[PDB]
Design an enzyme around this catalytic site. Structure first.
Site, PDB file in Angstrom:
ATOM      1  CG  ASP A   1      -1.781   1.179   1.402  1.00 11.42           C
ATOM      2  OD1 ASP A   1      -2.764   1.052   2.193  1.00 11.42           O
ATOM      3  OD2 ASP A   1      -1.536   2.227   0.738  1.00 11.42           O
ATOM      4  CG  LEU A   2       2.914   3.011  -3.521  1.00 10.86           C
ATOM      5  CD1 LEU A   2       3.595   1.799  -2.879  1.00 10.86           C
ATOM      6  CD2 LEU A   2       2.270   2.638  -4.822  1.00 10.86           C
TER       7      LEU A   2
ATOM      8  CE1 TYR B   1      -3.385   9.167  -7.931  1.00  7.21           C
ATOM      9  CE2 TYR B   1      -4.919  10.917  -7.362  1.00  7.21           C
ATOM     10  CZ  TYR B   1      -4.653   9.703  -7.959  1.00  7.21           C
ATOM     11  OH  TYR B   1      -5.693   9.066  -8.575  1.00  7.21           O
TER      12      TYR B   1
ATOM     13  NE  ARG C   1      -1.927  11.718   4.561  1.00  4.72           N
ATOM     14  CZ  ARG C   1      -2.245  10.502   4.107  1.00  4.72           C
ATOM     15  NH1 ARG C   1      -2.307   9.474   4.940  1.00  4.72           N
ATOM     16  NH2 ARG C   1      -2.507  10.309   2.819  1.00  4.72           N
TER      17      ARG C   1
ATOM     18  CG  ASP D   1      -3.276   3.688  -3.554  1.00 10.06           C
ATOM     19  OD1 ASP D   1      -3.389   4.554  -2.665  1.00 10.06           O
ATOM     20  OD2 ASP D   1      -4.247   2.985  -3.959  1.00 10.06           O
ATOM     21  CD  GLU D   2      -5.221  -0.269  -0.701  1.00  9.26           C
ATOM     22  OE1 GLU D   2      -5.667  -1.393  -0.424  1.00  9.26           O
ATOM     23  OE2 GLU D   2      -5.646   0.739  -0.118  1.00  9.26           O
TER      24      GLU D   2
HETATM   25  N1  LIG Z   1     -11.705   7.399  -1.849  1.00  5.46           N
HETATM   26  C1  LIG Z   1     -10.644   7.769  -2.600  1.00  5.46           C
HETATM   27  C2  LIG Z   1      -9.455   7.097  -2.388  1.00  5.46           C
HETATM   28  C3  LIG Z   1      -8.310   7.431  -3.119  1.00  5.46           C
HETATM   29  N2  LIG Z   1      -8.282   8.443  -4.096  1.00  5.46           N
HETATM   30  C4  LIG Z   1      -7.028   8.768  -4.842  1.00  5.46           C
HETATM   31  C5  LIG Z   1      -6.157   9.734  -3.994  1.00  5.46           C
HETATM   32  C6  LIG Z   1      -4.888   8.946  -3.609  1.00  5.46           C
HETATM   33  O1  LIG Z   1      -3.658   9.598  -4.035  1.00  5.46           O
HETATM   34  C7  LIG Z   1      -5.019   7.554  -4.285  1.00  5.46           C
HETATM   35  C8  LIG Z   1      -5.098   6.373  -3.245  1.00  5.46           C
HETATM   36  O2  LIG Z   1      -5.761   6.689  -1.949  1.00  5.46           O
HETATM   37  P1  LIG Z   1      -5.457   5.872  -0.446  1.00  5.46           P
HETATM   38  O3  LIG Z   1      -6.768   5.858   0.293  1.00  5.46           O
HETATM   39  O4  LIG Z   1      -4.723   4.561  -0.672  1.00  5.46           O
HETATM   40  O5  LIG Z   1      -4.446   6.990   0.335  1.00  5.46           O
HETATM   41  P2  LIG Z   1      -2.890   7.488  -0.166  1.00  5.46           P
HETATM   42  O6  LIG Z   1      -2.072   6.274  -0.603  1.00  5.46           O
HETATM   43  O7  LIG Z   1      -3.113   8.617  -1.158  1.00  5.46           O
HETATM   44  O8  LIG Z   1      -2.309   8.079   1.435  1.00  5.46           O
HETATM   45  P3  LIG Z   1      -2.077   7.061   2.749  1.00  5.46           P
HETATM   46  O9  LIG Z   1      -1.853   5.638   2.341  1.00  5.46           O
HETATM   47  O10 LIG Z   1      -0.870   7.527   3.676  1.00  5.46           O
HETATM   48  O11 LIG Z   1      -3.407   7.228   3.668  1.00  5.46           O
HETATM   49  O12 LIG Z   1      -6.202   7.593  -5.168  1.00  5.46           O
HETATM   50  C9  LIG Z   1      -9.477   9.153  -4.337  1.00  5.46           C
HETATM   51  O13 LIG Z   1      -9.466  10.041  -5.197  1.00  5.46           O
HETATM   52  N3  LIG Z   1     -10.671   8.820  -3.592  1.00  5.46           N
END
Ligand SMILES: Nc1ccn([C@H]2C[C@H](O)[C@@H](COP(=O)(O)OP(=O)(O)OP(=O)(O)O)O2)c(=O)n1
Length: 370
Positions: A9-10, A14, A46, A101-102
């Site tokens: 999980d990245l 973005y 954050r 990202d997963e």
């Molecule tokens: N409900 C969502 C979830 C994600 N995204 C987009 C924004 C993120 O850049 C990416 C993946 O979201 P994640 O929930 O995995 O969160 P990030 O990886 O961005 O941050 P972190 O893992 O530290 O919480 O796709 C979106 O538009 N709407």
DNA sequence: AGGACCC
DNA sequence: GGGGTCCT
């Protein structure tokens, strides 16, 4: 036959990519913007009280330094997303993608192959890599502990590789199925990993504060349970099977009950190339409905490049809309064989426009790829 | 064609 | 928001 799965999980994906593009943004608090939305933001941001999917409206009012970059165009995040998956495919062919990202990888064959390599002696020297969920004691005499640790060693390598080879950091959870790996990967973030030993499975499952927090249980199922007195995981674990069937269908019922125990028999599927390509565009109203054609010429021109990059040919087109609220709609039809030759917009814009007349947001989707 | 789910 | 997936 017990599996070893990793969920990769990245971190703040973005914002990572933007931060690579423009390094003057590193350790400057960063949010990624799409319309009125702050879709994601960096950890530097954050800390200052920004949360994902906060309005740009508030977000500035909570951080008036927040540097915003526009992420309506997913080209680069898509491209980088695939490099990740491809790197993991190099470890084991069987990688499944959840969003951009997963990734899940089924490590079962790989761990077993590693173990086959070691002798009686260096089998006591097998150590964990990263966090162990709930600080649980390793028992080296436990065959399932041994595999889960080798699993964790593999995860650290994927993580070293992602960073070394693509400049990207992220989290990993290692466990015995997809549900658990997904839940444990988020316990220490950012940029850490957690392995879940089987004795700690109820502990994990019971740390959730709501059935909605279970991957599988979405916005609607939540409301269906919430309206039945079911709120905790244990409420779900102990609700009557029979009644739960009658309400949501033996299909949803019987699986979300397994889930509430930590049980998940679903295989990691090889994602491979995409089943579809689409572009979206949201707006406050567009009723000029010939300008509404222009939108459709933008979406097309871009989408066309992407398929032209792929080398697979789509046999079906879709137009999707939404009407001013106070639900989306779609019309499909095949792409004519004479015009599946990669001039091409000139015929496509009509198909979509009659599709248009058969009916806040415009959307074109190409699918049924061969 | 529209639904539920994921990010 | 701007993408994806599989099921009915
Ligand atoms: N409900 C969502 C979830 C994600 N995204 C987009 C924004 C993120 O850049 C990416 C993946 O979201 P994640 O929930 O995995 O969160 P990030 O990886 O961005 O941050 P972190 O893992 O530290 O919480 O796709 C979106 O538009 N709407």
């Amino acid at each position: 036959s017990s599996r070893v799965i990793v969920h990769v999980d990245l971190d703040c994906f973005y914002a990572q990519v933007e931060m690579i593009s423009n390094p003057e943004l590193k350790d400057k608090p960063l949010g990624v913007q799409q319309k009125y939305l702050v879709v994601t933001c960096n950890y530097e941001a954050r800390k200052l009280g920004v949360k994902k999917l906060m309005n740009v409206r508030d977000a500035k009012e909570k951080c008036p330094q927040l540097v915003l970059v526009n992420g309506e165009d997913l080209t680069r995040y898509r491209e980088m997303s695939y490099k990740v998956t491809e790197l993991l495919e190099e470890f084991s062919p069987v990688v499944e993608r959840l969003g951009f990202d997963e990734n899940f990888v089924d490590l079962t064959e790989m761990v077993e192959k590693r173990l086959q390599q070691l002798q009686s002696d260096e089998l006591s020297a097998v150590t964990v890599s990263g966090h162990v969920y709930n600080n649980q004691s390793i028992n080296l005499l436990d065959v399932l502990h041994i595999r889960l640790l080798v699993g964790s060693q593999i995860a650290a390598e994927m993580r070293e590789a992602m960073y070394n080879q693509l400049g990207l950091t992220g989290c990993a959870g290692v466990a015995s199925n997809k549900l658990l790996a997904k839940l444990v990967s988020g316990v220490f973030k950012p940029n850490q990993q957690t392995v879940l030993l089987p004795e700690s499975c109820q502990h994990l499952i019971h740390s959730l504060n709501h059935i909605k927090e279970i991957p599988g249980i979405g916005y609607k199922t939540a409301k269906c349970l919430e309206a039945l007195g079911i709120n905790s995981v244990r409420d779900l674990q102990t609700f009557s099977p029979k009644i739960l069937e009658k309400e949501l269908g033996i299909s949803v019922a019987q699986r979300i009950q397994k889930l509430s125990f930590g049980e998940d028999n679903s295989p990691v599927i090889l994602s491979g190339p995409p089943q579809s390509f689409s572009e979206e565009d949201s707006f406050k109203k567009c009723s000029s409905e010939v300008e509404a054609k222009n939108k459709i010429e933008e979406l097309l021109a871009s989408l066309l490049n992407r398929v032209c990059q792929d080398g697979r040919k789509p046999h079906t087109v879709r137009l999707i809309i939404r009407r001013y609220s106070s639900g989306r709609e779609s019309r499909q039809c095949p792409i004519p064989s004479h015009v599946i030759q990669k001039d091409v917009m000139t015929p496509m814009v009509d198909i979509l426009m009659k599709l248009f007349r058969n009916m806040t947001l415009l959307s074109v989707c190409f699918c049924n790829l061969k």
